[PDB]
């Protein structure tokens, strides 16, 4: 077949869709796009071809093969935020995302994804004991911050484990993020206009000097180290690789960073919202709360709880799909190939809508918020919200860890309620390069009251 979308009006096309992106931003756009077009066309973001695809079957093809292992995004842009051929989020250099990512995936899985479920137990209890720190003098609760600083202090004492300042490092990482979503696709003109950016590059200095301190007592430490062999962790296997050849300083430093990111950014907006849903959702509360009881008691919660805990499984996978975070992503084909019906050339940029694929597919009743849509066991292939294959979540398996031992944690303590009418469906949103609450509205407190 030849492909759907809008006209290529003697370069008249690219430039509309382009600005349709940076008006409505990523989210939306592609929405708008899957709605007026087909569930898989073509658009155009700076100059070239970028399919916007919400086809369960485009989807598993491309998330399954490794010459989709690659994303897109302004070379500038990443250059700016330090993102260009550097990390492993947007680093698109195939050899050195194969060389970097395999660092990750040791830190996020066997042994630390087990020492996870109690670290972010006890760094949510010792955060939930200093909630002066984010409650109001009517009792309105800032979750969003709360969530930021131990989901911080969690990743820090997992994988870094130098003592930091949470609440000042939590909004630097905001900062970052912000410029990230900024200058990810805006075209070359915007950058030669240089007090139009000064702004972003701003930010992500303030972060990435904060981290050159933190990694510079991490190296001062494993340099006058005893026993190296017992201590492992991310940021040391790292600087061990950099010590030996392996990698470049400026590469570890960015690792370090995206690993301290990571949770800040996406696990506590997905928290956020997953406790709006708990509040204007009573019959869902009782029934995680009676699995606490029947499974965990009033003893500390303990990796083996994790697999127990199967409606809190169900209930953290119903609102990544029905309310999700991150709803698309970003790849680009770096070999030719035939997609379902379509020709699909390399250096094809593909932005995978993974939200409105889990309302057109699989579930019974896709629009409404309801645990009967994973009341039968879901096949990975109509459900993908971490994404899966070569390049999927690098977090997907620790994160549902973290998810099932806050909200453990949390709720075992306090009933909490949502101020006004207020829930997920009528929180304003931004829709950009993730789906998040917009902060400049208010209205985004809560209230936690306790049990016994
Ligand atoms: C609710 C939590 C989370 C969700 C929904 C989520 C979702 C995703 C998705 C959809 C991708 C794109 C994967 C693809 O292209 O197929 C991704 C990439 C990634 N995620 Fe997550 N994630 C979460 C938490 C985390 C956490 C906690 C970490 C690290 C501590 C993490 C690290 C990453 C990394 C490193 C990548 C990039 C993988 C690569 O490009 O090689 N994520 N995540
Ligand atoms: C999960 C994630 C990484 C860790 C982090 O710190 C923040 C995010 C949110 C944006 C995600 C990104 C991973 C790559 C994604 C899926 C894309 O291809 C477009 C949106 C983007």
């Known amino acids: 077949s030849s492909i759907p979308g809008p006209g290529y009006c003697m370069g008249i096309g690219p430039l509309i869709s382009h600005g349709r992106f940076l008006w409505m ?64 989020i947007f680093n698109n250099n195939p050899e050195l995302w194969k060389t970097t990512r395999p660092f990750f995936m040791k830190a996020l899985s ?10 972010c137990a006890e760094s949510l209890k010792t955060h939930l004991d200093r909630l002066e720190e984010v409650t109001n003098e009517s009792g309105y609760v800032d979750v969003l911050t709360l969530l930021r600083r131990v989901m911080l202090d969690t990743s820090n004492t997992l994988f870094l ?12 990482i905001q900062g970052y993020f912000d410029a990230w979503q900024a200058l990810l696709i805006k075209p070359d003109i915007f950058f030669k206009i240089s007090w139009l950016y000064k702004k972003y590059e701003k930010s992500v200095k303030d972060l990435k000097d904060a981290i050159e ?7 001062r430490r494993i340099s006058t180290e005893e026993k190296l062999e017992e201590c492992m962790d ?29 949770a800040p950014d996406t696990m506590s907006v997905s928290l956020f919202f997953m406790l709006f849903l708990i509040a204007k959702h009573p019959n869902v509360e009782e029934a995680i709360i009676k699995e606490i009881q029947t ?13 127990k805990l199967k409606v809190m499984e169900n209930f953290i996978y119903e609102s990544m799909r029905y309310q999700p975070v991150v709803d698309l992503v970003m790849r680009k084909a770096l070999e030719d190939d035939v997609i379902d019906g379509y020709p699909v050339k390399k250096g094809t940029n593909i932005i995978l809508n993974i939200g409105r694929m889990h309302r057109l597919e699989f579930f019974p009743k ?59 469906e009528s929180i304003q949103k931004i829709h950009d390069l993730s789906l998040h609450p917009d902060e400049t509205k208010n209205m985004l407190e809560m209230i936690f009251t306790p049990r016994n």
């Not at 600087?239 to 990571?262: P, W």
């Open 25 to 88: 931003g990523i989210g939306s756009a592609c929405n708008y796009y899957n709605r007026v077009y087909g569930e898989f066309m073509r658009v155009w973001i700076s100059g070239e071809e970028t399919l916007i695809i919400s086809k369960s079957s485009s989807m598993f093809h491309i998330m399954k093969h490794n010459h989709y292992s690659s994303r897109f995004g302004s070379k500038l842009g990443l250059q700016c935020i330090g993102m260009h051929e550097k990390g492993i």
């Open 213 to 219: 301190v933190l990694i510079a007592e991490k190296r």
């Open 161 to 172: 484990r130098i003592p930091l300042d949470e609440s000042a490092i939590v909004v630097k």
């Open 295 to 307: 499974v965990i008691g009033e003893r500390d919660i303990k990796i083996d709880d994790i697999q």
């Open 366 to 424: 896709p629009n409404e918020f309801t645990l009967e849509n994973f009341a039968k066991n879901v096949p990975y292939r109509y459900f993908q919200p971490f994404g899966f294959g070569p390049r999927g979540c690098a977090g997907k398996y620790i994160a549902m860890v973290m998810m099932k031992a806050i909200l453990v944690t949390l709720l075992r303590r306090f009933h909490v309620k949502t101020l006004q009418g207020q829930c997920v």
């Open 110 to 119: 066997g042994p630390g994804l087990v020492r996870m479920v109690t670290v």
């Open 234 to 262: 991310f940021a040391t296997e790292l600087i061990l690789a950099e010590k030996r050849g392996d990698l470049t300083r400026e590469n570890v430093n960015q690792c370090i960073l995206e690993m301290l990111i990571a």
